[PDB]
Amino acid sequence: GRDPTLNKTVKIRQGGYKGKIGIVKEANGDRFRVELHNPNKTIPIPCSFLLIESTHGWVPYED
Amino acid sequence: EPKVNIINAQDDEVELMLSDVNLSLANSLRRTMLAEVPTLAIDLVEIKMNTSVLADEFISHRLGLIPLVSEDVEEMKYSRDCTCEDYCDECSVVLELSARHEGEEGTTDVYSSSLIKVSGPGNLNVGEPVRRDDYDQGILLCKLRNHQELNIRCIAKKGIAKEHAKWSPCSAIAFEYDPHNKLKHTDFWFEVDAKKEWPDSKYATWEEPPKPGEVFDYKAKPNRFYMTVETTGSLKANQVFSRGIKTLQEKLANVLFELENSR
Amino acid sequence: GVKYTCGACAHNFSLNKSDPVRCKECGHRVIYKARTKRMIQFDAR
Amino acid sequence: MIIPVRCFSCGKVVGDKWDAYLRLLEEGKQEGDALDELKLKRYCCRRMVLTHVDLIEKFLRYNPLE
Amino acid sequence: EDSMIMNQSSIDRGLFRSLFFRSYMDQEKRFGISIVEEFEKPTRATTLRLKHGTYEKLDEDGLIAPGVRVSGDDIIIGKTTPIPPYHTKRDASTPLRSTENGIVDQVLLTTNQEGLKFVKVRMRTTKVPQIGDKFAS
Amino acid sequence: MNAPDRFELFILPDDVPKLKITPDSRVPNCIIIKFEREDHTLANLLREELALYPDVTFVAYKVEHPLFANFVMRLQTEEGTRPKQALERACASIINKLKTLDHKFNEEWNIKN
Amino acid sequence: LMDDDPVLFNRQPSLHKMSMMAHRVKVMPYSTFRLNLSVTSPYNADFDG
RNA sequence: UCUUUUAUCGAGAGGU
Ligand SMILES: [Mg+2]
Ligand SMILES: [Zn+2]
Ligand SMILES: [Zn+2]
Ligand SMILES: [Zn+2]
């Protein structure tokens, strides 16, 4: 891979998609592509807007 | 200058005659009541377990259409102006449901009254689903046969009737004006007679019938209006009306603010 | 290894890919995989 | 398949008028009077309940695969 | 010219709204006495000519589980073919169609006629009317 | 697959003014106002009211395409008055009317119960 | 593809030389093309699918 | 710094 958060499950904490589950489909740089679970669409979102799941709860981009 | 004359008033519907105003103010009031009365409704569903004979989004749809009580919904903030992460307490109401069948003979009916409010910002009057009486069971969500557990957890957020037709408070609103046809704003189809081939609108006695020796005036305008408002229990009609007028006033005040600060 | 359910006796078990295809109970020969263990959201819309 | 919740044209909730409708059909009432007693005057909410096809009755008799 | 005007609120409340299933199938062909094909997950070290979509949604025996969302070209059945005599296996997968977005519904696993494995998958999705769909009286 | 997100019918992005004004040139003392994220409700409620003051000569509006969200409005008074002030006056008047209506409705309700 | 590009526009089966005409582009949402109805006469077209 | 795979022949059911 070319990053450590691809394909990992994510929760969105800002924006119109707040509270929605997703998966990091592509994280080239700063602007990520999260594949939302709820409707069949992959959205552009800033990496600042995401919580990643880790060993203990949803951590911000410090994982 | 405006006037009001309530003809029928009760719990969840009003029938009134709105008089001595303009037209697009009453019409804009109607559209405002059908389009912008911010209410509350279920928004997210996280199904923990489903083993019934119904696909998920079918259930999540039916839950998506359930009326909840929202008297104090003009204080809770929207979902986009809370600075927390995921959700907190000043932005949603959390419900949970858990039902199972037990035995070999039987067909348990999972209703809507079995929804239990868990956590919400207090102490405000939200969350609880609308109940008709003191015994009534309400909406019929699902059915369960032998060994079919169902357990789910739902989020509930605030919205208006422009983002989805579920946050809408009123059903249908009756509206009319000028029953005897005096302004000649319309024309009537007929085969033999245009009088013995049409119904009489329930209000053709409140105004007087025109004289057959009358000429045609040409300065009058639609003046006396007749409207009737229903609800689904999520609100009560007087609150719908007052909140509508309040929202319209806030809109005009916003536009005036833009015009003033744009200087 | 992973959960598997029989077609008939409704009996759960697990496999390590080494067994042949039947339940340890009645031995019915059309087995279904079980639900997964993640979390599934929706929109209610 | 199963009774809807809202209506389709206006939105008057008709998800709690199926049990009373069946029970009033056991007592020998008529559909016109069984709807005149459930308070349904606009014929959209009337057609919503008069022409429903209840299918879940079948969908249960197939033994559970789970 | 035979077009119409449909209401949005009725579409929202559930008018003309439909479910849409689909199913896939794959089995195991035998070539040698001991040379067969095994459902599994290929890794980059051993197999060759991998396809592009993510392989991270397969469990360990090569069959994706129900409850997982699958979109464009997500690999659902990883199957390998052994190379005729390191780096000694060739990929023979089965990807989801390049124009579908669905939730996996039900997976089936049984034996064939000869005596080897035999898998089916069943995906489903929801469809709603919009500007372009056809209707008829 | 190609659907506009619904909330875009009433949530304003950052780089879009809620209101923009441009003066027309073919005739003097006439201006063009451009409203974002508004429909027939505000536009009509303003139009029927401005179309009454004995000093505004031509007022109109239109919605260009119903799939987007905006409308444009043409306003022309006479030489003495500047149109912006007149628009503000109309807003104030309408607000007053709504207030009175709410008051009398509440009185009639508390009497009728 | 952006606003005001000239694209060729065609329907099968083309007969007389009016069934292939270049229109100006205009980006719109949703999933279908758009025509002004006055150009339904050389194309022998109708919106019935 | 890219790239990145869709057999073949034949038969049938359909849409303007
Ligand atoms: Mg045609
Ligand atoms: Zn919050
Ligand atoms: Zn068994
Ligand atoms: Zn109705």
Automatic annotation (TrEMBL), chain B:
Q: Which residues bind Zn(2+) 1?
A: 79, 84, 91
Q: Pinpoint the DNA-directed RNA polymerase RpoA/D/Rpb3-type domain residues.
A: 13-258
Any idea which UniProt keywords this protein has?
DNA-directed RNA polymerase, Metal-binding, Nucleus, Transcription, Zinc
Q: One biological process GO term for this chain? A: transcription initiation at RNA polymerase II promoter
GO molecular function list? DNA binding; DNA-directed RNA polymerase activity; metal ion binding; protein dimerization activity; RNA-directed RNA polymerase activity
Pfam families named among the record's database cross-references: RNA_pol_A_bac (PF01000), RNA_pol_L (PF01193)
Q: Where in the cell is it found?
A: Nucleus
Cellular component (GO) terms are: RNA polymerase II, core complex
Where is Zn(2+) 3 annotated to bind?
82, 90-91
Please name the SUPFAM superfamilies in this protein's record.
Insert subdomain of RNA polymerase alpha subunit (SSF56553), RBP11-like subunits of RNA polymerase (SSF55257)
Q: Which residues bind Zn(2+) 2?
A: 82, 84, 88, 91
Entry annotated with the keyword Transcription: yes
CDD domains in UniProt: RNAP_II_RPB3 (cd07031)
The protein's superkingdom reads Eukaryota
UniProt cross-references to PROSITE patterns, sorted A to Z: RNA_POL_D_30KD
Looking up InterPro entries in the UniProt record yields: DNA-dir_RNA_pol_30-40kDasu_CS, DNA-dir_RNA_pol_insert, DNA-dir_RNA_pol_RpoA/D/Rpb3, RBP11-like, RNAP_Rpo3/Rpb3/RPAC1, RNApol_insert_sf, Rpo3/RPB3_RNA_Pol_subunit
- Which amino acids does the record list as binding Zn(2+) 6? 88, 91
Q: Which family does it belong to?
A: Belongs to the archaeal Rpo3/eukaryotic RPB3 RNA polymerase subunit family.
Quaternary structure and interacting proteins, as annotated: Component of the RNA polymerase II (Pol II) complex consisting of 12 subunits.
- Which protein, by its recorded name, is this? DNA-directed RNA polymerase II subunit RPB3
Annotated organism of origin: Komagataella phaffii (strain GS115 / ATCC 20864) (Yeast)
TrEMBL record, chain D:
What Gene3D superfamilies would the database entry show? Homeodomain-like
Gene Ontology annotations of biological process type:
transcription by RNA polymerase I; transcription by RNA polymerase II; tRNA transcription by RNA polymerase III
Q: Which InterPro entries match?
A: RNA_pol_su_RPB10, RNA_pol_suN_Zn-BS, RPABC5/Rpb10
Q: Provide the alphabetized UniProt keywords.
A: DNA-directed RNA polymerase, Metal-binding, Transcription, Zinc
Q: Name one GO molecular function term.
A: DNA-directed RNA polymerase activity
Q: Give the record's GO CC terms.
A: RNA polymerase I complex; RNA polymerase II, core complex; RNA polymerase III complex
Q: Which Pfam families does the entry link to? A: RNA_pol_N
Places the protein is found: Nucleus
Principal location class = nucleus
> Please, which domain of life does this record's source organism belong to?
Eukaryota
Residues the record lists as binding Zn(2+): 7, 10, 44-45
**HAMAP family from the entry?**
RNApol_arch_Rpo10 (MF_00250)
* UniProt family annotation: Belongs to the archaeal Rpo10/eukaryotic RPB10 RNA polymerase subunit family.
Q: Spell out the protein name for this chain.
A: DNA-directed RNA polymerases I, II, and III subunit RPABC5
Its source organism is Komagataella phaffii (strain GS115 / ATCC 20864) (Yeast)
Automatic annotation (TrEMBL), chain E:
Covered range of the whole protein: 836 to 982 of 1227
Entry's family note: Belongs to the RNA polymerase beta chain family.
Name recorded for this polypeptide: DNA-directed RNA polymerase subunit beta
Q: So what does this one do?
A: DNA-dependent RNA polymerase catalyzes the transcription of DNA into RNA using the four ribonucleoside triphosphates as substrates.
- Summary of subunit composition and partner proteins: Component of the RNA polymerase II (Pol II) complex consisting of 12 subunits.
Subcellular location(s) per record: Nucleus
List all membrane-crossing ranges. Answer: none
Please indicate which superkingdom the organism of origin belongs to: Eukaryota
TrEMBL record, chain G:
Can you tell me which residues bind Mg(2+) 1?
Answer: 46, 48
Give the subcellular location.
Nucleus
Q: Which residues bind Mg(2+) 2?
A: 48
Q: Which residues form a coiled coil?
A: none
Similarity annotation: Belongs to the RNA polymerase beta' chain family.
Described by its record, this protein's role is as follows: DNA-dependent RNA polymerase catalyzes the transcription of DNA into RNA using the four ribonucleoside triphosphates as substrates.
Q: What is this protein called?
A: DNA-directed RNA polymerase subunit
Where in the full protein does the shown chain start and end, and how long is the full protein?
Answer: 437 to 485 of 1743
